[PDB]
């Protein structure tokens, strides 16, 4: 299709939505702030302005005709840029060197490029909103009103915590009532912040209190998620590598750590306790259809959602919780030191399992959570460089995982792991796997012995509503908050798209491909902790069990 | 320091051997067949030449003085190196399309880039030698006397079986008499090979074989050695990765193995059985020092040059025969059909493994043997993306190993998978490395109660003859033929020189890192192996023990 | 859409001609020798086989359907294609050292990959044809039967001289009766070379001429085309630079060249004197349309094709005979010294200009025709790093031109030139461009004093035989035998499809616009030559036209 940009012949799509599009496509770039996540719409900016037949428009929202001349670089619309980007700058709070967005930032990067040294209009004071009651931060003093938060948390993820609030200079996204984050229906599951293109949303650092513990004498024990190693090259801007999580073993030894261990040995762990616990359900057929509770967004989605299902959800604690309570209750002993004298490090790609850590039905078992961007900070402050750093197992006796434990990094595989333990026990003759839709999966399982069941897996919270509207068919259904599972995790490197994720999902896969133990019962670490510390249902119950309460407001 | 060249001002380093090198260092590149490895030496090509001081001679041979003028390219230079080129071409064997160095070839690249496409001068017949009665096959119609194998293999291999012999026209590089080289001393280590910039020496090349395996219906199986995966990454170009092995398996099973093993898995059953036999060795004070026959090369030297020290080679085979034999005469039957159903593959960076799988103690265990460039080979055939191959695990129960057996790799892995095995049995107090010179390690090992000895790793033939000179205080000697062990093996990737085998070295020790099982006796594999199949003394020695007999001509 | 390709998920396009094409585009490639080049068609070397429904099948004539199962490489399919192979190169002129597709061919990659070191089949003698008679050479000992060159020659090129002869193993791609190529109709466009995958058709080779001339003590003397600064960069794998003309003429000063000028000044010359023929063939309405006599491949084909408009042709020689001309009997003259002491080296992206000049109206003006890729092979033989060479301008008198004279390089080029020299005469209002097709261009112009007229510009011969069929209404057409004109020349580096000829297009563009003389008569030094050495009507005559004669055989 033939269009003219500057007096210059450009080919561009025969079919396309808009003009902006178009010369994107076909490399030509325009100035704009509106495309900033996958949860972008166009208008807002205005400073997408072309001129065709004399008059300025906005190309996003330009269909473009055949012989159309446009100018995308005229004086007026060099002007009309300027001040556009002048004027948010003015009332934005510019201190990059604090922002958790610093040197990832579209705007940073425009006001680079646009040559802003000084701020002609005035910084007028608004009415700005500081929230750091939860592991999620909120800062209104950076927001740009993109709203691709808005629509992340309603659309996506199908909370809805955060709207557009006010009208005109004291338009504000933020909750109901500038209610801190901690007390509102906000799962934590940190998508919000995973597309926040500013620093408005950022995850609370607790870097400090790691320092704090490596300095004094206390023990500490590090214990890193599956989906941490598939994503944390990205900080670094290196191609994946399956033997990331030894690099991190050594990098954490190296500065400190006594000992790291592999949560995936705790997510085989819980894999092995909730399929018993599934199979006594299916058995006695109570409290079905069972939930899995290894996503904490889930949880306490559930509990402020869906008091009724609580006893449905699965009894047993996710994976960080289940190896840090061995840790600290089994191992401790184990090691003849106190139980206050060690300071357990879970590094996580998710900000709600901070908020988890916290819980008091867990206080005081997991000192502190670090996201993966966090720990990416720790090795860049090193300087030492990760890629060539020689790679060492994890420590004994929780270093070592099945593929199924491994693959709980992903959506399915708490699932796939719960379905591997009950074949390596009663067999699986056949499983029947269908796709309703984008993010659900639903399975036919028929064991050897008959009493088949279905189970469900769905990825990205939103679309659980809807599947528990339509299906009273299934006996067991997994949820993960995050798309694509917790390789699309909230405290994942930024940027956090699709097609990232699809990168870290297929990293993972590849991770757990060269695993030579096929299911837990072959992990034989696991089965010497059940025979030694785990044998009665009293100490099984009070290791691994949790309980969950509903969740209101009055 | 001042030089001119081709008028025009250029600084080169103060103190250079001669011109060529210097201009190379400062990035100006002369044309020459001189430089073809790392046992070349300049004069003979005589395609250098430069002209100083308006007479020509050659920049390899000339010390820069400051000031110089130099023409590096004139008409008269010019002509005489294409005459020199076309001299060379003219009685060359050129059948690149059935050439080993095809693509890899210097002499090749330059008939390209010189124009050279009709032979003016004539091809004179000469008396070529043909020779493909070892692993090592000669065609001393495609060698351009460079003599680089001549040096390779009389002061690195210390063997010296191949030079010049006869002069002019008929000067050829041979075995004496034109002897076959079955017939000589030669030990088929191939560092010949790995560094002829021809084809005239090249390795046995046996995909028809496998080719012909595979169509039929007897059951294939493969194992793949240690330093296999830590170099077949060159031979496309990518980065390495520590998943290469399971990414084999995957693409093996694709064309249609049945099974695939891991031979680092034989490598700690032989540093198992071997660690036992030298105890047994030390207790009563006989038999010693101690040679490991793990490298085959090494063996059939010690049969040629050390006919009493044959008693104080260790009598346990190699991994590849051990291996081999536990999978034909111990899983043949467990898996119900009979040893001749099984085709055994094994997939080697050694040429000297072709000769001992085809040796009288080991007939018709392993059924063909491909070095890392024949596997190459089939993967390059196939076409498939090795890159993005989904990796899987090696197969039951001979697909796991401690990072001791994958060790084996690389010069002294067998001295510490030994010393591993000892330690974990009869506990190590300390030991003391020591480096007398290059390629010589000798550790001083002191056990719990007492019994200390010393043990020695020699990497390269040659160095073997003056450190059995002047050592008699050592009771184990790791020898291996090739510098820095089987990761510079003949069959590896071209071009095989110091700095790339460094580098297959540094990927091995990354592969071990990543391994959880730290010795043999941590492989409940092989301990249940052990006590399965190897109980009694008789059985193991039938299966893993192997004897050797005196080599000489008459 | 979904397939199984060896046991995996594959997505391919929905519609889509074969499964070879879609699993390309999706990045699975099936090894074949079937694609080979634009011209190229499926179905003849049978080595893209899969096995679908346990029936093996060529990929590329199977049409892909949802759910299909296809594996890729099974042994059996191994054999099949090693077989294939290997049946090709047993008959094939195995002779890479020599061959001028050395380094970028298929089957020599192929040779390579597929571990061919011994011929199996039997090297059975077939009745080969070589063919030295023109600048074009064949061999059919090389040639695979590809076809590719009978379709471009026939289809492409409108000339059809070379076909498929007799059947069975005695196939052969050659001309009627086998007659040279030389005496028959064949233009020498060099298409076909362009197009062929071996060595079977290539260019003949002239760099023993230029060094025996070097050598001597006559003054050698090179002038560049245009078209060939545009592309000798893909030869050395390095981008673009609109500085490459200037880097020529420092390395052939460098390797002793006294002179170097810029032939795109004969093209500025050659314009100037065709607008003045062409208005005086228009003012006295005699010998229309004018055909520009530039392209040497057009002018013999319309002396085969066309003697009734041969008095239609420009007289005006070419850009390379009008400057070689004006050096050997002006410039000559200036230096003092005689005629029979220059050595004039023409360098040009065209096989056609060999054949022009050897042609008897032209003997005796250009010594030697060297393609760019024997300029190519020139620098690579120095070794000289060309990317660092130092750019020095033409030489005086002759190293200037217009941007209308560079821009002769590529399809439309003189006529835009002699545009330009009749604008800055007689004024143009406006021209009117129409493309009634791919490779044709129809303006209209209207002068200031009325005399409107139609020029067209055809690039590719055989477009030309039709538009002549259908259009009487144009004055003035210009032919290039070549696709895109020059920069797609025959002699032009290889591989030479119409991507690579836009990019060298392109290239030469960006080269036009850095050149401040926007037309000939701005050119000084061309005016002062015309001043001095041009005046008089027989002197010009004499010096820059020439004449044509009839071609017929009998
Ligand atoms: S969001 Fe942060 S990094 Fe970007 S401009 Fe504002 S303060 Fe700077
Ligand atoms: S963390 Fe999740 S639920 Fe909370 S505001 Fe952000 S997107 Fe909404
Ligand atoms: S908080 Fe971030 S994503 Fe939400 S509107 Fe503000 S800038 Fe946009
Ligand atoms: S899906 Fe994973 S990363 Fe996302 S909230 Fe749940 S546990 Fe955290
Ligand atoms: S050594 Fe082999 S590849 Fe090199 S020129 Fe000779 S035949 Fe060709
Ligand atoms: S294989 Fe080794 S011993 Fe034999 S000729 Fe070559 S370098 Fe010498
Ligand atoms: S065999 Fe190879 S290394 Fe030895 S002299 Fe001949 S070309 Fe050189
Ligand atoms: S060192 Fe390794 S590669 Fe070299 S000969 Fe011995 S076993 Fe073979
Ligand atoms: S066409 Fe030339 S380069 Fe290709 S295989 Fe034949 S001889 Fe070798
Ligand atoms: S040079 Fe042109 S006309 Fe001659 S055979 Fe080749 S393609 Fe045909
Ligand atoms: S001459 Fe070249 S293009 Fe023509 S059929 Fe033979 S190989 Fe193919
Ligand atoms: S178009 Fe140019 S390269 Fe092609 S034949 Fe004509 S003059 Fe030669
Ligand atoms: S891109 Fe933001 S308004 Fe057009
Ligand atoms: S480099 Fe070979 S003789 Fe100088
Ligand atoms: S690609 Fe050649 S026959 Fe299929």
Known sequence: ????????????????????????????????????????????????????????????????????????????????????????????????????????????????????????????????????????????????????????????????????????????????????????????????????????????????????????????????????????????????????????????????????????????????????????????????????????????????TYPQYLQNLSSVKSPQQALGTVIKKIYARKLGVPEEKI?????????????????????GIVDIVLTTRELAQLIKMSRIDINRVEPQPFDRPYGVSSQAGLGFGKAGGVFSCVLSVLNEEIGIEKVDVKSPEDGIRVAEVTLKDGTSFKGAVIYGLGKVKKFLEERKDVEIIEVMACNYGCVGGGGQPYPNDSRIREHRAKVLRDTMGIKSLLTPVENLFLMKLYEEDLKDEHTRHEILHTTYRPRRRY
Chains 1, 2, 3 share one sequence.
């Open 1 to 304: 299709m033939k269009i003219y940009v500057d007096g210059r012949e450009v080919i561009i799509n025969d079919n396309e939505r808009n003009l902006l599009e178009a010369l994107k496509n076909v490399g030509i770039e325009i100035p704009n702030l509106c495309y900033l996540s996958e949860a972008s719409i166009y208008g807002a900016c205005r400073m997408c302005l072309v001129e065709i037949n004399g008059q300025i428009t906005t190309s996003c929202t330009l269909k473009p005709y055949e012989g159309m001349k446009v100018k995308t670089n005229t004086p007026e619309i060099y002007e009309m840029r300027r001040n556009i980007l002048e004027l948010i700058l003015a009332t934005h709070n510019r201190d990059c060197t604090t922002c958790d967005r610093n040197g990832s930032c579209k705007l940073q990067k425009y006001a680079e490029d646009f040559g802003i040294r000084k701020i002609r209009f005035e910084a007028l004071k608004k009415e700005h909103v500081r929230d750091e009651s939860a592991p999620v931060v909120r800062d209104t003093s950076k927001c740009i009103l993109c709203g691709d938060c808005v629509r992340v948390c309603e659309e996506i993820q199908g909370v809805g915590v955060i709207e557009f609030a006010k009208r005109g200079f004291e338009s504000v996204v933020t909750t109901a009532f500038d209610t801190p984050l901690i007390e509102t229906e906000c799962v934590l599951c940190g998508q919000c912040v995973a597309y926040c293109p500013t620093g408005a949303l950022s995850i609370r650092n607790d870097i400090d209190k790691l320092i704090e513990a490596l300095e004094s004498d206390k023990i500490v024990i590090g214990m890193i998620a599956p989906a941490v190693r598939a994503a944390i090259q990205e900080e670094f801007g290196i191609d994946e590598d399956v033997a990331m999580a030894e690099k991190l073993v050594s990098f954490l030894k190296t500065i400190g750590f006594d000992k790291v261990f592999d949560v995936s040995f705790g997510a085989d762990l819980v894999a092995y306790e909730e399929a018993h616990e599934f199979y006594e359900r299916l058995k006695k057929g109570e409290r079905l259809p069972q939930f899995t509770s290894c996503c904490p967004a889930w949880v306490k989605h559930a509990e402020h």
């Open 343 to 363: 300071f357990l490090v879970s590094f996580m790609p998710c900000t709600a399992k901070k908020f988890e850590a916290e819980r008091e039905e867990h206080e």
